[PDB]
């Protein structure tokens, strides 16, 4: 007769939601807070394990979201508060060689700033982007800063970069992370090849909207992942199997000056522009871009009708923060017009130039109670990034438009292959063996 035998150390697990901690590899940003990583920690193949994955229901995403926002806010705690600067600014047109594209984009404003002494004021003359100021009370030359009628602006500290240093997510003892290695995995359902890891690879916390930059590429083919593909209320995350190179610039040689506005409190502002005034822009190779969309279309036709029409169009609405391609390029915040990328209909060394707007006072996260002022950067800025995926939304003829307003989508595009489970080492089975 078979009797109960208790085994401890049994290789069994259950789905679980627990706390993960961050780690990193070896001008301070998104660090100190995380533990240094182990070199080449471990990966165990788990040769005969099949397991079910379900991105979008994955709480690792929520934790990464919370950590990034929290660390972001923490970095501003010791920085100068630009509340003494919520004043009447007198603003006129910029006296330089301005191309047509830049007319009305910059204003030369003069304000009275506070000083080291409480009883003294100074007179400062600085350039502002039009998007950061608002005219007021029917006075032709009188402006105020955009966010003094809501939150206090905090100046970001000049010594802190926003470089997207990769963050690894590590399991606590008693937990493990399972990794799906199926090259055709679309975010849900059974995964035939699942390995075990200690900690995820580092993921760069890049913040952008409609085009995902510097992420992972699909191993073989473009993969379209969505919670419910026939539900037009859902976003579609499209991973590319090839990068598209994008070259962005702010072609204006700026002089940055600073003043004290308080007791050891420095304020930074664009003083003057050397040379001509030109619009910021991004360059995308035309042929590469057309090949990229053709691949996306071929894959969309597997979910939509085959003998169909697929149309790409620009966003139909919303504010600048969601109708453009937002990204951080060398510390400056760009809002680029992608209508030059999504203007075609697909039926059954030239380049595309995207004009860009620049803002210094930004909100980062979709929040109301915070603002931040990005100090301007001296000189001219250039950056080159890889487009690794698109975020699309959907309206015969299926029409798709750029989306991406919700940041958790960016993090899902990297965390989709990971699952957290709890180890359950204790269990029983019948064995022919009695005390």
């Amino acid at each position: 007769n078979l009797w109960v035998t208790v085994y401890y150390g049994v290789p069994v697990w259950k789905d679980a939601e627990t706390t993960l901690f961050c780690a990193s590899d070896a001008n301070v940003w998104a660090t100190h807070a995380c533990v240094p990583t182990d070199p080449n920690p471990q990966e165990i193949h788990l040769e005969n394990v099949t397991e079910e994955f379900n991105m979008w229901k994955n709480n690792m995403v929520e934790q990464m979201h919370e950590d990034i926002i929290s660390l972001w806010d923490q970095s501003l705690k010791p920085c100068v508060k630009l509340t003494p600067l919520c004043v009447t600014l007198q603003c006129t047109n910029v006296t330089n060689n301005i191309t047509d594209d830049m007319r009305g984009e910059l204003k030369n404003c003069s304000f009275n700033a506070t000083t080291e002494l409480r009883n003294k004021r100074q007179k400062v003359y600085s350039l502002f982007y039009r998007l950061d100021i608002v005219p007021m009370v029917d006075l032709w030359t009188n402006y105020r800063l955009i966010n003094c009628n809501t939150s206090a602006i905090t100046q970001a500290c000049p010594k802190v970069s926003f470089e997207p240093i990769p963050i690894h997510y590590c399991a606590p003892a008693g937990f493990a992370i399972l990794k799906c290695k199926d090259k055709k995995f679309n975010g849900t359902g059974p995964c035939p090849s699942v390995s075990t890891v200690q900690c995820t690879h580092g993921i760069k916390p890049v913040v952008s909207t409609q085009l995902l930059l510097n992420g992972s590429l699909a191993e073989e083919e473009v993969i379209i992942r969505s919670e419910n593909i026939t539900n037009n209320a859902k976003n579609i995350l499209v991973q590319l199997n090839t990068p598209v190179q994008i070259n962005c610039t702010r072609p204006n040689n700026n002089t940055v000056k600073s003043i004290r506005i308080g007791p050891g409190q420095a304020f930074y502002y664009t003083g003057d522009i050397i040379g001509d005034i030109r619009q910021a822009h991004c360059n995308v190779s035309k042929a590469t871009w057309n090949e990229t969309l053709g691949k996306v279309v071929k894959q969309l036709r597997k979910h939509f009708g085959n003998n169909t029409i697929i149309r790409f169009a620009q966003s139909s609405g919303g504010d600048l923060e969601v109708t453009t391609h937002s990204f951080n390029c060398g510390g400056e915040f760009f809002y680029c017009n992608t209508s030059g990328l999504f203007n075609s209909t697909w039926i059954s060394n030239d380049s595309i130039t995207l004009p860009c707007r620049i803002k210094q006072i930004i909100n980062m996260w979709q929040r109301i109670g915070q603002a931040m002022y990005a100090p301007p950067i001296q000189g001219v800025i250039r950056c080159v990034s890889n487009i690794t995926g698109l975020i699309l939304t959907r309206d015969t003829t299926e029409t798709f438009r750029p989306g991406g307003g919700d940041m958790r989508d960016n993090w899902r595009s990297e965390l989709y292959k990971y699952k957290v489970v709890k180890i359950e080492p204790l269990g029983v089975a019948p064995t022919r063996c009695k005390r």
Binding site: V4, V6, Y8, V10, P11, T19, N48, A429
Partner: protein
């Protein structure tokens, strides 16, 4: 040969790696890390307390005096141990678990009292 490497293997093979998994159970900002460390310890201790209650303290493979009521799983010892992985077994008999644990506790209580009465 590593942690959970045997998860896809048959129970009769996987049982030889019990020490591999056992050793992976132990090891305001910073508070969530303390919470994770504290719960790892609490879960560990509960499993050890339970093995103690059942009279399985100090061992990875513990034979008991409780018999296998076929109504839990009427499968035979060339199927359970040679054709099923621990994950599939755990699912098969997950309903009838807080019966088995209760029986193991009762059996040990009787064994302790019988053993004191002999040592007299």
């Amino acid at each position: 040969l590593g942690f959970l490497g045997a998860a896809g293997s048959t129970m009769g093979a996987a049982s030889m790696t019990l020490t591999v998994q056992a050793r992976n159970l132990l090891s305001h900002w910073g508070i969530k890390q303390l919470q994770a460390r504290v719960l790892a310890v609490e879960h560990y201790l509960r499993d050890q307390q339970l093995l103690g209650i059942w009279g399985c303290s100090g061992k990875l493979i513990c034979c008991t005096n409780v018999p296998w009521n076929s109504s839990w799983s009427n499968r035979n010892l060339s199927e359970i141990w040679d054709n099923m992985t621990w994950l599939q077994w755990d699912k098969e008999i997950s309903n009838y678990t807080q019966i088995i644990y209760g029986l193991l506790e009762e059996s040990q209580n009787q064994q302790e009292k019988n053993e004191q009465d002999l040592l007299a």
